[PDB]
Amino acid sequence: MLYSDFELLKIGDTSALDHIHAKYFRSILWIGRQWLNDDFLIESLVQDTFLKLWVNRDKLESPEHIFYFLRFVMKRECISYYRKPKY
DNA sequence: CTAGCGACTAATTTTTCGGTTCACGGTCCCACAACTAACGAC
């Protein structure tokens, strides 16, 4: 049975994350490049966004919701770096 | 040789910034990898 990637993420199978990563990696990279200008920090934030999606995988309800989550989170990460004294 | 004589120091409190968390609609040159057309063997 070929379940959709939403149910693979819900099950607890790590290859699901490979699927969502390979699908939305470049979109999240573009989202980050829109808000910042440091590719290093953008890549770090993309990794954090996907890992935090995996951690909060017990909070998704819709197949599209996953995508929304990613975009949302990634944006706010960029936003937080406007306030960090270190950065 | 000797004697008379002319107010600072210690204890307690209070407050601004950072951390954390939540998280949907040009050029020229020298090598290196393909690569293919022809050539030779089973």
**What determination technique applies here?**
cryo-EM
Q: State, as a whole number of angstroms, the distance between the CA of A33 and the C1' of B21.
A: 25
Show which positions of strand B are touched by protein (CB under 7 A): 17-19, 21-25
The DSSP 8-state label assigned to residue A47 in this structure reads H
Q: Is A4 in contact with A54 (CB distance < 8 Å)?
A: no
- Those residues whose C-beta lies under 8 Å from the C-beta of residue A4, and which sit 6 or more positions away, are A63
Distance separating the N- and C-terminal Cα atoms of chain A? 48
Q: Is A44 in contact with A28 (CB distance < 8 Å)?
A: no
The DSSP 8-state label assigned to residue A81 in this structure reads T
Resolution value (Å, 1 decimal): 2.9
Interface residues, strand B, Cβ cutoff 7 Å: A 52, 55-56, 59, 61-62, 64-65, 68-69, 71-73, 76, 80, 84-86
